């Protein structure tokens, strides 16, 4: 339009708007027809934008159910390779060197974890509200006590990592890599300054729970939820127990000095230390976004506390009897928990096939592999012991090395005085009838939509006894069969145990 | 890492999976658990994606209700230009040139429809099964018609393009210009292979309608909707309704060759001839894909017929009375009817301020007033005349030169035989209690989301009264308030009705 | 013959099957007609490969 | 806090969170601090530069 | 000392003046919220300045307290008394202090 070309300073003086609202912030988008205060709650003048997303993922050794198993072949290969550089100590198996090894990975992902919640509080910035408050409410700490000590916290991270540099463990692995990295990061869904925050947090760790001569055993340690206020004497509380059964055995000595011998020091895994100008900053990742939009929720883990009416003995350990299943490491858990001794309805809708959403046209091998990391279908039912079968347990064909159980989403509430909203979610969400539930899930669907590689939901309704398909947008998508799920979990997780 | 690089062979063995499902048929995906055919309704393993949008949108002369609107402006501006370069017959006015300026318009709008619809027939790609009935049965006419009758199609819309030819208009009026481009392309939502097209098809024409010392009258002519076979007689019917007192017209000819003498044949608007091998292309336009996103649903027209208690006499006619407002063009028309006689509850959610959302960081004044061109926010309910008021109308702030009334969305059917569906929707989507109003929005929510650039949505719900705030993925977006928009619709309407001088 | 040089993008894109499933491993079929599971044992949708013969 | 006042840190965090406790959560704040902003490029606002143990 | 606008009674004063030309500034280059004053847009800018000056101060606090010398036996209890401090508290509490004042120009790059 030539009338643009020729008044230009008329169309400036018309186009002034102001842009660029810092997010975190409630805001209110006015009333149109002053008069439609008639209509209270008819007309949705609120305007909240989520900002930070926490994927609850969980370290695993992938499905292992007899002695084929990537992890007992990596087991028997890291043991081959540490006993034919061993002269001396001969009193432990490929089993129990991989326990250690799995020991070492969760505390690994601990000190990240806690090296993260260092880094996050220094974060403040004016066009984002949620930094930090609402990421370290998401992690499960307390602002106000990691203001308070700042110093405290990075000598306790420094000197968990000075103690967990007493024993060693392989640095050719990428176990150790992948799991620091991906629970140590910050990823925003686009480049934009006021973009959404992707995080990590472990669900669970691997009490390694020594006792009884019949093998080891490594039984959940839980870990703090969103909206807690744990404060710095809780995390110390939770590593000392994590290292209460760690030092002091002299198995566990004689493993680390046959490991410090096998792999040199150079070639062993350290961790790095941390210091005052330390700065974490969110990065834009598109590998870790396209896997966290195909990621499957697969419920709360299973504890021994856990009651389950028809299923017990169904708690997630790694269980290692020399006697049991020819001495392989067995790790075989049920999926479908969600906390309560219900059925849960929700779940019925993972029964599908899933379908692998990819960006662009052209996907790579080791991109289609990446992107399919946190992707878990269910198989088959579990068999209820007993004729009472009030929750229904759902057998995994093959998982990776992480499995995802929730997912906390914080927001700022509609209502007065507009503070910080807790979420937890799985991928399918249920909805019965209710006067706010349908609003409530409304509002989730909107939060949801606002990250761009959000997981696919898969809603269900119990009035009309329905439950729906995937709720994203599809740009480049493919049917995936269980099949090819485990083949692509069985390379990936052998690539994962490599040296 | 060095693993991948050692066992390649088995990575590419592991991940060759099949991409590119063409769109346009119902996919299974199957059960991953066997035993889930007990759950019948509880597993959703049907997968539909929608193929293509329309946006039923109307021309509008832009909110006069006095003689100082912009439409005014430009009806006098040209009428001093025709009058000043012409010595001869003094007849008309200015009021009686605008309107046939307007009449020019729908002319040429009715002729691009039917051309868009003749050349949408020969598009056939294998990716995209919605080629090219999907986009026939939206634009509301018989596939089967017009491949039966291809050739009686050519001859009618190239006589339609040969007798709108005779008049003459400006061509430096960009009204023309915009909305042929709006009425005569696809646009892909994406710059990929199988997107979603998006579509502009007239809900309203402006029959002429000249008689009576008492001025001219615009009244509004009727569309065919998508899910109707309306078929070549029909579309003869139509051209010959709105052409009935246009044509062989001795003042209307007086006013063509006065036009031709102001604007000579190189500075007027001409329209491209059609045959069998014009073809089509969808191309990708972020300015109409902008300007689609911030649009926001007016309801459907008010006629003559459509009875309305408690508004009588709101039809959407521009009406020019010499013995009213001194004689000025005057079209104030009430929003907010959906076609039936009762409330609609829906439309109480869109009393909020709308927020104009813009790709990028950066936004120009250009693309800034080029993207909200279709918004249209209510003000001021239109009060009803008596103690009845059953239905509810919301007077318009100020709008642009299209005003879009429905919304239709083509996808295939969950059910044998997967045939085509009709979705025909507002920015506003009310849903009672029902058994299957719910997963039917659901599936309505999931369609919309496919779509990138799509309109922001407002849901209602029946048992808790309450209505949701724009149901789209804000980027980078403000709060627009009424002032602003009737300056930014004032501003788009003046720079529409452009006279060189 | 001149359709498939016409259309040679979307035959590809018809035409990209998964190939080389490594033997070892249990695969199923799938059912072809979901109301098959009401005739339990009358539908094989297993599929074993044997993959080594002693002789002795 | 005047001279021959005995206040600790507890007491300073007291003031400041007094001081700051009606300028967080007001949303006309907050639309003030988006404008100024905006108008002021990031590079152009003023910045409290950090402090560590060994500054004299 | 007392940080002040400079005595302001009617409209032609420099805080006035100086309002009026930042919000000029601001709305001239703002397109979207208009629903503050320049007089709005200048009490933020002076509680801006307060919460600066009250960093300021606290930064000093915690610097002060590292002096040490042979020359002068003020340095630097005299100084943290004369500020209001506990130099006793400072003493023990030197970490918390020093995260404390990063905390609160983190927290002041807010706004």
């Given at each position: 339009v030539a009338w643009y070309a020729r008044y230009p300073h008329i169309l400036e003086e018309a186009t002034r708007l102001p842009f660029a609202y810092p997010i975190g912030q409630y805001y209110?988008?006015?009333?149109?027809?002053?008069?439609?205060t008639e209509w209270s709650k008819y007309v949705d003048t609120s305007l909240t934008i989520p900002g930070v997303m926490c994927v609850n993922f969980t370290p695993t050794p992938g499905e292992s159910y007899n002695k084929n198993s990537?992890?007992?072949?990596?087991?028997?290969?890291?043991?081959?390779?540490?006993?034919?550089?061993?002269?001396?100590?001969?009193?432990?198996?490929?089993?129990?060197?991989?326990?250690?090894?799995?020991?070492?990975?969760?505390?690994?992902?601990?000190?990240?974890?806690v090296r993260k919640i260092l880094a996050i509080s220094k974060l403040y910035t004016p066009v984002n509200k949620y930094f930090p408050r609402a990421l370290l409410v998401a992690l499960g700490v307390d602002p106000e006590d990691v203001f308070a000590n700042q110093a405290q916290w990075e000598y306790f991270v420094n000197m968990v990592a000075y103690r967990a540099?007493?024993?060693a463990a392989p640095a050719s692995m990428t176990y150790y890599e992948r799991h620091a990295w991906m629970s140590n990061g910050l990823y925003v869904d686009q480049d934009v300054t006021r973009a959404q925050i992707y995080m990590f947090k472990p669900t669970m760790l691997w009490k390694y729970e020594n006792l009884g001569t019949t093998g080891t055993k490594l039984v959940p340690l839980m870990m703090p939820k969103a909206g807690?206020?744990?404060?710095?004497?809780?995390?110390?509380?939770?590593?000392?127990?994590?290292?209460?059964?760690?030092?002091?055995?002299?198995?566990?000595?004689?493993?680390?000095?046959?490991?410090?011998?096998a792999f040199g020091a150079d070639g062993l895994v350290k961790l790095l230390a941390v210091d005052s100008t330390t700065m974490t900053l969110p990065t834009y990742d598109p590998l870790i976004l396209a896997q966290i939009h195909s990621?499957?929720?697969?419920?709360?883990?299973?504890?021994?506390?856990?009651?389950?009416?028809g299923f017990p003995g169904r708690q997630w350990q790694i269980t290692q009897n020399p006697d049991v299943n020819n001495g392989a490491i067995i790790f075989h858990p049920s999926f479908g928990y969600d906390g309560q001794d219900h059925e849960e309805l929700s779940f019925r809708a993972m029964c599908s096939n899933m379908i692998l959403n990819l960006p662009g046209e052209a996907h790579s091998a080791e991109m289609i592999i990446e992107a399919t990391r946190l992707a878990t279908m269910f198989q088959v039912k579990a068999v209820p012991a007993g004729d009472t079968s009030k929750p229904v347990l759902y057998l995994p064909n093959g998982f990776g090395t992480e499995v995802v159980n929730d997912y906390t989403m914080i927001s700022v509430?509609?209502?007065?005085?507009?503070?910080?909203?807790?979420?937890?979610?799985?991928?399918?969400?249920?909805?019965?009838?209710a006067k706010e539930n349908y609003v409530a899930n409304l509002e989730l669907l909107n939060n949801i939509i606002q990250f761009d590689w959000a997981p696919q939901l898969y809603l269900t309704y119990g009035i009309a006894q329905e439950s729906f398909g995937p709720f994203a947008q599809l740009n480049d998508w493919t049917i995936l069969t269980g099949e090819t799920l485990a083949r692509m979990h069985e390379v990936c997780v052998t690539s994962m145990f490599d040296v």
């Open positions: 209110d988008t006015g009333y149109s027809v002053a008069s439609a990537p992890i007992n072949i990596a087991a028997q290969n890291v043991y081959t390779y540490v006993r034919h550089m061993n002269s001396g100590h001969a009193n432990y198996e490929q089993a129990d060197l991989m326990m250690y090894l799995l020991a070492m990975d969760s505390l690994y992902i601990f000190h990240s974890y540099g007493a024993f807690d206020n744990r404060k710095l004497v809780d995390f110390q509380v939770l590593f000392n127990n994590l290292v209460s059964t760690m030092l002091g055995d002299e198995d566990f000595g004689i493993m680390s000095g046959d490991v410090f011998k990621a499957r929720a697969v419920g709360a883990p299973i504890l021994e506390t856990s009651t389950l009416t509430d509609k209502a007065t005085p507009h503070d910080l909203t807790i979420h937890t979610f799985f991928n399918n969400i249920l909805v019965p009838n």
